[PDB]
Design a protein around this motif. Structure first.
Motif, PDB file in Angstrom:
ATOM      1  N   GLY A  15       0.809  -1.209   0.000  1.00 61.01           N
ATOM      2  CA  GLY A  15       0.000   0.000   0.000  1.00 61.01           C
ATOM      3  C   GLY A  15       0.843   1.261   0.000  1.00 61.01           C
ATOM      4  O   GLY A  15       0.560   2.214  -0.737  1.00 61.01           O
ATOM      5  N   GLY A  16       1.902   1.277   0.813  1.00 61.76           N
ATOM      6  CA  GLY A  16       2.759   2.445   0.872  1.00 61.76           C
ATOM      7  C   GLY A  16       3.420   2.752  -0.455  1.00 61.76           C
ATOM      8  O   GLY A  16       3.454   3.905  -0.884  1.00 61.76           O
ATOM      9  N   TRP A  74      11.798   4.346   9.657  1.00 61.04           N
ATOM     10  CA  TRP A  74      11.657   5.791   9.769  1.00 61.04           C
ATOM     11  C   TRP A  74      11.979   6.525   8.475  1.00 61.04           C
ATOM     12  O   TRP A  74      11.838   7.751   8.426  1.00 61.04           O
ATOM     13  N   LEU A  75      12.412   5.817   7.434  1.00 56.86           N
ATOM     14  CA  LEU A  75      12.575   6.391   6.105  1.00 56.86           C
ATOM     15  C   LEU A  75      11.331   6.197   5.249  1.00 56.86           C
ATOM     16  O   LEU A  75      10.856   7.142   4.606  1.00 56.86           O
ATOM     17  N   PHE A  76      10.790   4.977   5.242  1.00 59.07           N
ATOM     18  CA  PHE A  76       9.624   4.636   4.442  1.00 59.07           C
ATOM     19  C   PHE A  76       8.377   5.410   4.846  1.00 59.07           C
ATOM     20  O   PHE A  76       7.427   5.469   4.060  1.00 59.07           O
ATOM     21  N   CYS A 117      12.345  -0.937   1.597  1.00 59.52           N
ATOM     22  CA  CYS A 117      11.598  -2.136   1.236  1.00 59.52           C
ATOM     23  C   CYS A 117      12.537  -3.278   0.882  1.00 59.52           C
ATOM     24  O   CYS A 117      12.315  -4.423   1.295  1.00 59.52           O
ATOM     25  N   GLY A 118      13.593  -2.987   0.121  1.00 52.96           N
ATOM     26  CA  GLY A 118      14.551  -4.025  -0.219  1.00 52.96           C
ATOM     27  C   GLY A 118      15.246  -4.596   1.001  1.00 52.96           C
ATOM     28  O   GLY A 118      15.418  -5.812   1.119  1.00 52.96           O
ATOM     29  N   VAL A 175      -1.888   7.507   5.877  1.00 48.70           N
ATOM     30  CA  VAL A 175      -1.296   6.176   5.756  1.00 48.70           C
ATOM     31  C   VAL A 175       0.162   6.150   6.210  1.00 48.70           C
ATOM     32  O   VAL A 175       0.701   5.069   6.485  1.00 48.70           O
ATOM     33  N   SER A 176       0.817   7.311   6.315  1.00 44.25           N
ATOM     34  CA  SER A 176       2.188   7.329   6.819  1.00 44.25           C
ATOM     35  C   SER A 176       2.267   6.781   8.240  1.00 44.25           C
ATOM     36  O   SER A 176       3.171   6.003   8.564  1.00 44.25           O
ATOM     37  N   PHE A 177       1.324   7.172   9.101  1.00 43.96           N
ATOM     38  CA  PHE A 177       1.321   6.665  10.470  1.00 43.96           C
ATOM     39  C   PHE A 177       1.071   5.161  10.507  1.00 43.96           C
ATOM     40  O   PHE A 177       1.679   4.448  11.313  1.00 43.96           O
TER      41      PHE A 177
END
Ligand SMILES: CCCCCCCCCCC(CCCCCCCCCC)(CO[C@H]1O[C@@H](CO)[C@H](O[C@@H]2O[C@@H](CO)[C@H](O)[C@@H](O)[C@@H]2O)[C@@H](O)[C@@H]1O)CO[C@H]1O[C@@H](CO)[C@H](O[C@@H]2O[C@@H](CO)[C@H](O)[C@@H](O)[C@@H]2O)[C@@H](O)[C@H]1O
Ligand SMILES: CCCCCCCCCCC(CCCCCCCCCC)(CO[C@H]1O[C@@H](CO)[C@H](O[C@@H]2O[C@@H](CO)[C@H](O)[C@@H](O)[C@@H]2O)[C@@H](O)[C@@H]1O)CO[C@H]1O[C@@H](CO)[C@H](O[C@@H]2O[C@@H](CO)[C@H](O)[C@@H](O)[C@@H]2O)[C@@H](O)[C@H]1O
Length: 404
Positions: A15-16, A74-76, A117-118, A175-177
């Motif tokens: 989703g992100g 904390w980056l994504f 993600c990787g 959606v960030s939270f």
């Protein structure tokens, strides 16, 4: 109890990343209904797009180097907020320079999407299933780009242009939270278990440069064929202008299936592997698809004429896409897998850096040689370059694999 955690992590990341890619082309999605309010021209469009492209190109490398140290949770989420806030600010402003300055920050924040993600995929999933889910997650961009225009059309009809970007930014911030709360960086944090390498050693491994050269050649050939193929088919083969759109659509449709199939087949090949530090189980498909690329290029160039029907062109395009969109994913997986566990991000960043120069080579010089002699005279050059690269990779196959 790995099932629930893997499911929720992958759903959150999917989703992100879908929202990240959707909030990157929203300017192009809403463009038509934006000139009537603010009178612009193509020059401003080029300015904004160029600013975003430069920002993204720098940010990809910077993030890839940086993500090896900072947390991959904390980056994504920070990147997604920044993207949402920049989108809202874009929505509440109307003039060229604020657009140009805001879209630069949009690209800079957009560059922070993939490396976390990787890293999470590498430190959560099994070593024999790391390529299937990589390929599946890579299709979120395709889904967003294919479904976005329809949503924009049915949305902007019932509202304005400033009424869409605000909603998109609000959704991104909301959606960030959720993505920050649901993502776990490592399986050892919860209470489960899963399983001395300086950067100079990484820079002193021939395998990295071999992968870089392969990626350069493959990406350059793909860019050339996906850019000037329509012009070749419309100015030398005497075909109708309608077959170009079908050819490109077939190429993309074949490419998606090629990526997914390459990922799954390469993952299956690893199960029956005699693990060692020489060779690579994923090298069979990294060569078969390149040979298919060369064969398809030869057949497209030689046995195509006004007598040829549409079905032959569609089949050729589908085969070229299938053989072209796979090695890119395999190069990414190999570069993000054959590196030390504490240096995954840097190796992938260095490999991906080698693509901007490939695109530049596939750009103006190709048009120059086409202008000097012909289109076929340049396609033949691309063909022989690809064949030589495939051969060279064939002889150089048992080179040392593990970097460091
Ligand atoms: C601290 C910097 C240090 C380096 C300085 C050397 C030069 C740096 C500039 C190189 C760099 C950033 C370098 C990244 C970090 C390097 C770190 C390496 C360290 C080694 C140890 C920006 O390069 C240029 O990008 C161009 C924008 O395109 C701009 O030119 C303008 O546009 C020209 C036509 O594009 C025209 O001629 C004219 O309109 C301008 O001229 C320039 O403003 C910009 O300089 C690479 O940018 C590249 O990104 C890729 C994205 O894929 C772009 O590919 C395409 O982009 C879109 C259309 O471009 C397409 O939509 C996209 O489909 C396609 O993919 C490339 O095209 C290019 O953008
Ligand atoms: C496990 C997977 C889960 C499911 C999700 C993935 C599967 C969905 C794929 C959707 C898909 C396949 C189309 C065939 C559908 C059958 C496919 C079979 C499976 C589905 C059953 C839709 O592809 C087209 O879809 C059209 C909309 O339907 C869009 O038309 C628009 O609408 C018009 C008005 O609405 C408007 O005038 C206008 O805005 C468009 O003209 C097109 O823009 C789009 O290309 C692929 O989309 C993806 O393909 C890649 C290719 O690289 C493309 O990215 C490209 O990258 C650069 C170079 O790499 C390209 O240079 C760059 O150009 C592009 O960015 C995009 O295409 C991307 O989005």
């Amino acid at each position: 109890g790995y099932g629930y955690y893997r499911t929720v992590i992958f759903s959150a990341m999917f989703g992100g990343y879908s929202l990240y890619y959707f909030n990157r082309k929203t300017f192009s999605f809403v463009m038509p209904s934006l000139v009537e309010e603010i009178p612009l021209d193509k020059d401003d469009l080029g300015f904004i797009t160029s600013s975003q492209s430069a920002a993204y190109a720098i940010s990809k490398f910077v993030s890839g180097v940086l993500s090896d140290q900072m947390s991959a949770r904390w980056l994504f989420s920070s990147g997604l907020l920044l993207v949402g806030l920049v989108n809202i600010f874009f929505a509440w402003s109307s003039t060229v320079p604020v657009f140009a300055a805001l879209w630069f920050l949009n690209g800079l924040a957009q560059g922070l999407g993939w490396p976390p993600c990787g890293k999470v995929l590498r430190k959560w999933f099994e070593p024999s299933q790391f390529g299937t889910w990589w390929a599946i997650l890579s299709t979120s961009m395709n889904l967003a780009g294919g479904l976005g225009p329809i949503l924009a059309t049915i949305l902007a009809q019932s509202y304005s242009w400033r009424s869409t970007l605000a909603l998109s930014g609000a959704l991104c911030v909301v959606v960030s939270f959720l993505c920050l709360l649901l993502i776990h960086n490592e399986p050892a944090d919860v209470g489960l278990r899963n399983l001395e390498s300086t950067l100079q050693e990484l820079l002193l491994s021939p395998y990295l440069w071999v992968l870089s050269t392969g990626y350069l050649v493959v990406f350059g050939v793909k860019t050339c064929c996906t850019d000037w193929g329509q012009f070749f088919l419309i100015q030398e083969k005497g075909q109708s202008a309608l077959v170009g759109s079908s050819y490109m659509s077939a190429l993309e449709v074949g490419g998606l299936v090629g990526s997914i199939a390459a990922g799954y087949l390469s993952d299956r090949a690893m199960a029956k592997a005699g693990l060692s530090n020489y060779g690579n189980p994923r090298h069979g498909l990294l060569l078969f698809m390149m040979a298919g690329m060369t064969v398809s290029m030869y057949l497209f160039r030689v046995t195509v004429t006004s007598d040829s029907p549409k079905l032959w062109i569609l089949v050729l395009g589908a085969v070229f896409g299938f053989s072209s969109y796979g090695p890119i994913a395999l190069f990414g997986v190999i570069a993000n897998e054959s590196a030390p566990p504490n240096l995954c991000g840097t190796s992938h960043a260095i490999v991906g850096l080698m693509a901007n120069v490939g695109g530049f080579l596939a750009g103006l010089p190709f048009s120059t040689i086409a202008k000097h002699y012909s289109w076929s005279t340049a396609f033949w050059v691309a063909e022989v370059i690809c064949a030589a690269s495939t051969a060279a990779f064939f002889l150089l196959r048992n080179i040392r694999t593990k970097m460091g």
